[model samples]
Target: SMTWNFHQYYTNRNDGLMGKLVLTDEEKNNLKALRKIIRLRTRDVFEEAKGIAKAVKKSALTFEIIQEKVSTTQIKHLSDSEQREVAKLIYEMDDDARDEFLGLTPRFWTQGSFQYDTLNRPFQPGQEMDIDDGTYMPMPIIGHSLLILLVDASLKSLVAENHGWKFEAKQTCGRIKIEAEKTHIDVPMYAIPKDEFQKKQIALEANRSYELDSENVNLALREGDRKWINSDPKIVEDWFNDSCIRIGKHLRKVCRFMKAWRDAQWDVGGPSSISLMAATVNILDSVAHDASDLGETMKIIAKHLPSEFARGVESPDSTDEKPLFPPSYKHGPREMDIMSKLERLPEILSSAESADSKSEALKKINMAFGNRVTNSELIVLAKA
Candidate 1:
């Protein structure tokens, strides 16, 4: 019965409701666009906050800092002229005198930290810069004791001629000490096969350069007991060179850092340079190649050292089953001490990274690295 005017009433009622509460299409679209913009803005703000957090955690001990502060503290290498002079003197030893004393002239080649460029200033007060030069002679035809005596006598004569240099015959090598320079050259005597020596001599006669074929030649080193032991410095050298190639140049820097750390931690005895080098190379090989940050690389090394040193680090080239440090050796106490310091390294580095002021950061780093890091280097800036 009410249908007579229902259509008009329905239109009026619907228009009033829509006008009051409903949005136009343009309004709705604008609202959707605004909502999208708000969501994007929120995301950007969150991303910026995350970036700030990351910046806060970024390491303050940068490579520049390590190079300038840490690595720079090491003693400089022998001057080029000095190195050449030493080499020239050893090589120009009177052939007749050498033959008379040892029955064969020896070939000399440098080795050890000097060769590797990982040399550090002596940590202990009385210690000096150690430079190793391998003295290769033909297999001694005489008794081992006689050979040792002749070598010692020849070295003594050589040292006598050089003014201001002192000589001491150590178990494995003849040490030439330069007291003023705080340096010593260790000439470890090694005997190569007679055939190899003859070949090298022929090459020399022909005026052709001869490279030592470490693969074919078996080298025997004179031991303290006046016995000949199978040992080759070349093998160790090859291993180090290969590691340098594989790990990139950062390998050397890391090695230097490790040595500096060891020197900082222990004045007298700690991990030998070779042991530390081998350990660092092994760890870096597993974790990453070409690590950019010294502090982070050190942290990684420190984290793994407990487990690595626990089992004892093995020689990369030695066929001998003995590790670089045997369990029976006094290495236990030294290892414990090293570990105690190394365990603190990560926390120290982290604190340095997050420090609010440059002074605070440098202080943390120096605590781990000692005075070698130097207070002059600023690690970070104070927040405004």
Candidate 2:
């Protein structure tokens, strides 16, 4: 049922050329009135935003499909190392991503989730991979999908009570009694051969695998960046600790998040909690972008980070004796003027029709970050 009482307010209200808040008397009145309306219709506003987000996601998916189309081989051809480097390019817009992960890993994922119970004969609950009598469904769902559930569930949980029917699609243990109702989404570890993974492996040596007789750490990104991620090969605290496998695992997860979010239009944040959402997007974008720039190999992009961040990103075995990935320089607190800006956003947004002002805000923030900020360079366009 459509509500008929419509106040024809102009959402197309631009601050004119200045992109400032200088609105016309009519526009100002409309803006003030519109803000009230938008505030009242926060649901509709967010839905609109969400729609735009969907379009953005479609655009991203189109782009990825195009990229996939262009490459004779699928994205899988890039190898984990190469794919990571490529993904990093998408993120380099902000630096906050270097320290903060694009998305957090779930306990079920890291702690080993239980699924489909292999339904094997003589079901042995606690056993190694081969001897494990239970059905062995070692499926992995990487990407923002996990966090999609995690964040959405966590955020609205307070508002929406957990009726014990919480989303555990990715839960370690399945609770659904009905077999048909218990549908599982098993995300596999997308991989290519080590040789191909090496070819596109950025900024590192592939032969390290040959020499060390270790293929797991064959991540090329770390070859030239041994100090960046694997400062101490002995204590086993660096990226090489679990071999490149751990980093690869994280890379796998983040990339999946990157892929899904990109599919979700990669716009991130909206007005209700724009700053928090934007910050999340900014940070995650940085993580992926920097990781990509480390060049197709699993290396530490944070190696070049200003000290404060690099210092905080420490592993247990890390030591001052030899920093695996030293800070790019001694970067002190480069705190964002975000709090002030974020606080003003709602009002600024009240001034804008979209209930958002992404472009203007981005321009301001980019200037604040000293112009090094970058997102997809958007190169494929054949501009006339």
Candidate 3:
């Protein structure tokens, strides 16, 4: 059954083929050709084996495969109609109430994870879905104390008008809770200097996109001694959009995957979504764009995140001179927990890559992401 008996020919030399020290030209030529054939056959077998391994690895963890789970488990954004209704409600504030509360109607703009397209469903029950809609008011210097009262009164009036919606004023934002939907809209009110506001209004009238600089916008903080902090959501949004375009659109979905992982790992607080996004984009910027495969990209991120976190996450908009997290977090319990989980991630993925069956591979992956990663697609992939 053997095509060529290497043991008999080379080791045993059973036919006395390799015993002679010299041979005729025809005999030497015949031996040389046989040697070439053996070399070529060995190379062919090795190449085929490598090809099989690559195929199996790709089958286990391709972008489409990971995305199938991410797409199904993550929450959907507010629909176009739903967004329109909320906008209408906010813009339709009565003139009398506006004068009594804000002294002028504030311009509204959407921001946060919804705007970034990285929104994730709550991993635990009773967690409220967050939708951030910013309120920009044009006014002369109003005391921080008065601004808080005014913003509070404005949101309270809006909630009072809309039956069944409860209101809560947070440190940096006012929350309007729609209990039926298990969701809430956060209104972070900003005060823009009147001159800059006028310029923005003029640009809007001319149908031009005019963005407010961070220096021009001050966010009202209600915690402790009330104060106004310089913050601009648009700057970070713009930075994220530009980074995605430059890096690859796949980076957006990568961000969503990281958020989902964070949710799965921590029921309460871990890293904030923005902090994670900023860190991810920063890490990806330094590496080759291998985002075509989501699992590999995730592995790369997990490998680099601990070092980057040690340096502290830089704000995407460069708003802060200091990093996002305090220096204490560099070696803190939270950092250690994140590091340990990330260290385990590569091992889990490697196990999945070499798994013998689709079911076994999916099971290995579930260890990293929890049971939200459904095995239904593996069944479909197997049949197809």
Judged by whole-model lDDT over C-alpha atoms, candidate 2 comes out at 0.25
Ranking according to lDDT, highest score first: 3, 1, 2
> Candidate 2, which segments miss by more than 4 Å at Cα?
1-355, 365-384
Q: Per-candidate TM vs. native?
A: 0.64, 0.16, 0.66
Over 4 Å off in model 1, which ranges? 1-103, 158-164, 200-226, 327-331, 375-378, 381-384
Tell me the TM-score of model 2. 0.16
- Report the Cα lDDT for candidate 1: 0.54
Tell me how far the alpha carbon of residue 40 in candidate 2 is from the true structure, in angstroms, after superposition. 70
lDDT of 3 by residue, 1-384 (tens): 111111111111122112211134564344344333323432332233223223334354443433232222211122334333322332333444333333344566668875676655555555556677676667664344434443444445455556777878688887767666556777787888766777877888998447665786888887876477788888889999999998896677667666666666777676778878888988899987465455567777877776766677778756667666544344677767766765676787567656666567667765655565453233222111
lDDT of 1 by residue, 236-294 (tens): 88899899998886677667666766766776677777878888888988986325444
Clashes of each: 0, 21, 0
Q: For model 2, what is the error of residue 117's alpha carbon versus the real structure, in angstroms, after optimal superposition? A: 38
| Distance from true location, Cα of 34 in model 3, Å | 79
**Every candidate's lDDT:** 0.54, 0.25, 0.57
Q: How many steric clashes does model 1 contain?
A: 0
Which candidate number would show the highest TM-score if scored against the true structure?
3
Better of 2 and 3 by lDDT: 3
